[PDB]
Structure formats: C-alpha cells, structure tokens
C-alpha cells in the first residue's frame, strides 16, 4: 500500500496474508476471509504455483515479523481458479481457496459478507484497500498491514485512463487523480473493502494497474459482485 498508515490489531479481520514456501517462504498475495473454509484472492497470484502443496494462509495476523516456526496456519485443499481468467488485465482475476481445516470465528479472524443482492443502486463512499504490499516501487513486504482509503472511479473514467486494455464491468477501479494512495507489489488478492450502514462488504480483488499510486492511473479491482453466481456456485 502507497500513502497508507498502519492498522491495528482486529482492524480488518477478513484479511489473510498468503505465503508460498519455496524456494523460501514469503508473503504472495493477500486474500480475504468469506466462510469457514474459503479465501477469496486474485488468480494472477497463482502463476508458477505447481500445487496448493507451497501454500500457506494465515489469518489474524497484523505483523509478518508475528509469524514464527510455531505460528499456525492454515494448509490449502484446493486452488479454483475462475475458467475465464488468462492474465489480470483481461479481467477473471477471481480465484478461491478451500482450507483444509475450517476458520475459528474471533476478534482478529472473521468473514466479509459479499455485496449484497439488491444492492444495485448503493454508491459506496467509504471503501479500503489493505495490504502489506510495497510502499513504493523497489520496496519489500511491508512488516505491518496498512490500509488507506481511496474512492472509486467511474468505469468510464478508468477506461480513458486506461486506453490500451479492456476496462469492463467486470472490473472497478480506485484512485485519486493526483494519486499518492494505492495498493501496490504483494497488495493482490486482498479486499477493497467499503461500509455501508455499518456493514463491511467486499466490493473489490486488488488486481492490477499501471505502476504504483502515479497520478490518473487508479488501481483495478476485481468487481465482486459480478462474480457472486460464481462464488456461491464453488463454495456450496
Ligand atoms: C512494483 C511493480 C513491479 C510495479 N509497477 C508491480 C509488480 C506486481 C507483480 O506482483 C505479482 C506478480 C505475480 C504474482 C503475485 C504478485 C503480487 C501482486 O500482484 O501484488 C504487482 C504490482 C501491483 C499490484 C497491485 C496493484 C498494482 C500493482 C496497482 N497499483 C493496483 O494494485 C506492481
């Protein structure tokens, strides 16, 4: 996350941080709590992985520097990777996770609802991107989750941003025009996560866009709730 501040201990409690275990373990991508035994992440994070055998997920996490030999975590059934998805920018960027073991519900680890249905018409005005992506480019992974508010962007706009690639409604953006937030290197496959009637709902997959926080290039997200069919098909 670029232009974020750090977040506390409980504060977005759907957040997992992917780990991939060789040829070391690091941090991949983020990913977001929606049942008991499903991540919902970015498939574009997948390249390269020859199984779910190299994967981690841990949840109630707030620092990487927290996990540690003994720290537990959750091993991965399955990788289900929507069967439209070819790179990020072309969109499908939507994959699932089945854990082996199901999510404990507490105060540091819990779902995000979807957008809900009927809930066409909402204008969501207070969405969060988090991540422990980079904070610029060049950076590492960062040791504390950040988070920072950014405000959609109409998919017409994004499309003149974005002249060179397909901008559907399958997808939503989010940036400033002067830019200095966005999410960023290891941010994919968390939420953009926005409030409405004091209910978090995940609108958005951090998914791609061109650099980092640069100036009318808005980040691209995974529209959500174009995908629900599909999520509640998979996770039934
Ligand atoms: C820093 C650099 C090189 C630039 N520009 C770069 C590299 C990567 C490559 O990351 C992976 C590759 C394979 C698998 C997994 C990942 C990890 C991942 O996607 O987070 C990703 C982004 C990036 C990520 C999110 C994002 C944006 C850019 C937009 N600002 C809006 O949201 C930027």
Redesign the pocket.
């Known amino acids: 996350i670029?232009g974020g501040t750090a977040s506390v201990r409980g504060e977005w409690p759907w957040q997992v941080t992917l780990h991939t275990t060789s040829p070391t373990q690091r941090h991949?991508?983020?990913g977001s709590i929606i049942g008991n035994q499903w991540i919902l992440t970015?498939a574009?994070?997948?390249?390269?992985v020859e199984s779910p055998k190299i994967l981690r997920v841990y949840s109630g996490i707030l620092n990487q520097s927290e996990i540690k030999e003994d720290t537990s975590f959750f091993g991965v059934q399955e990788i289900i990777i929507h069967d439209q998805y070819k790179m990020?920018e072309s969109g499908y960027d939507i994959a699932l996770l089945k854990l082996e073991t199901t999510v404990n519900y507490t105060d540091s680890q819990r779902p995000i609802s979807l957008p809900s249905k009927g809930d066409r018409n909402v204008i969501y005005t207070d969405c969060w991107?988090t991540?422990w992506?980079?904070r610029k480019?060049?950076?590492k992974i960062q040791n504390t989750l950040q988070k920072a508010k950014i405000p959609l962007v109409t998919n017409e706009e994004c499309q003149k941003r974005y002249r060179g690639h397909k901008i559907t409604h399958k997808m939503i953006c989010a940036?400033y025009r002067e830019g200095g937030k966005?999410?960023?290197?290891?941010?994919?496959?968390?939420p953009l996560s926005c409030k409405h009637n004091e209910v978090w709902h995940l609108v958005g997959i951090?998914?791609?866009?061109?650099?980092?926080?640069?100036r009318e290039?808005?980040?691209?997200?995974t529209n959500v709730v174009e995908y629900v069919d599909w999520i509640l098909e998979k996770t039934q």
């Open positions: 670029v991949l991508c983020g970015a574009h994070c997948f390249y390269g990020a991107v991540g992506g980079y480019l060049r950076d940036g966005d999410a960023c290197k290891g941010d994919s496959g968390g951090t998914s791609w866009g061109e650099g980092c926080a640069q290039r808005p980040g691209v997200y």
